[PDB]
């Protein structure tokens, strides 16, 4: 009636805690949310959130002057994607050995930590958590 069975499509309300090990041989589907925009200076960030983890991808093409260590203010990352402590996303520029990193903070105003730049193709795919407390300055 209101029990869960070993057959049948079923919906199960309630907080369920599995003290043991759980295997899922089919798919596991959670809510997701995606977002994409130009942080600034021609740099695009694409985000997809699943639980407390965010999958990101840096894209775009530098098309204007970005000062060293500067904030990107064309577009902020919406709050629902913003982490509690700053996350430094390490990226690489095409065609050389140049690396950079973009901080995304709780405010969503991203900050470019490479040197001053006005050209090039930044790239980088990874993830960052939403709620990983850095614990101690």
């Amino acid at each position: 009636g209101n029990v869960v069975h070993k057959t049948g499509d079923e919906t199960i309300a309630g907080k369920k805690t599995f003290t043991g090990n759980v295997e899922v041989n089919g798919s596991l589907t959670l809510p997701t949310k995606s977002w994409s925009g130009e942080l600034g200076g021609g740099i695009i960030l694409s985000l997809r959130k699943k639980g407390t983890t965010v999958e990101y991808s840096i894209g775009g093409e530098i098309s204007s002057s970005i000062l060293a260590n500067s904030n990107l203010v064309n577009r902020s990352v919406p709050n629902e994607f913003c982490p509690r402590n700053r996350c430094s996303l390490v990226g690489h520029m095409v065609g050389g050995w140049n690396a950079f990193h973009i901080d995304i903070p709780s405010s969503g105003v991203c900050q470019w930590f490479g040197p001053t730049a006005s050209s090039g193709t930044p790239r980088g795919t990874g993830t960052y958590p939403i709620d990983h407390h850095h614990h101690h300055h």
């Binding site: 204007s64 002057s65 000062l67 060293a68 500067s70 040197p115 001053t116 730049a117 006005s118 050209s119």
Partner: protein
């Protein structure tokens, strides 16, 4: 106004002939964008040697600084365009200029362990 913006973009993007014609048309060799970068900074930082050369020939300012105190030299040091580094010094680039964190081109050569660049910086 517009010529200035057009020159900044052309120098940045390496459109040699755009640069040439725009200047003939009256663009200011020393226009600055919102953050203080000049065509010389833009062209140098992006390794466009002919443009650099032409800008200097038209009286580009070798020691122009941007909003955080960087000269063209600072920038080519950071990117490692040695041949542009030389052209700048040949035009009186100030090897001693300090940016806002009191870094000089030589400090950058040390930070990025570019031995060749430090070689030539040091020498001078």
């Amino acid at each position: 106004s517009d010529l200035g913006k057009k020159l900044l973009e052309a120098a940045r993007a390496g459109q040699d002939d755009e640069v040439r014609i725009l200047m003939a048309n009256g663009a200011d060799v020393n226009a600055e964008d919102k953050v203080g970068l000049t065509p010389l900074h833009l062209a140098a930082m992006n390794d466009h040697l002919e443009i650099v050369e032409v800008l200097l020939k038209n009286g580009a300012d070798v020691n122009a600084i941007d909003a955080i105190g960087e000269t063209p030299l600072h920038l080519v040091a950071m990117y490692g365009h040695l041949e542009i580094v030389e052209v700048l010094l040949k035009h009186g680039a100030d090897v001693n200029a300090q940016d806002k964190f009191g870094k000089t081109a030589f400090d950058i050569s040390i930070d990025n362990g570019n031995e060749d660049l430090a070689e030539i910086l040091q020498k001078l």
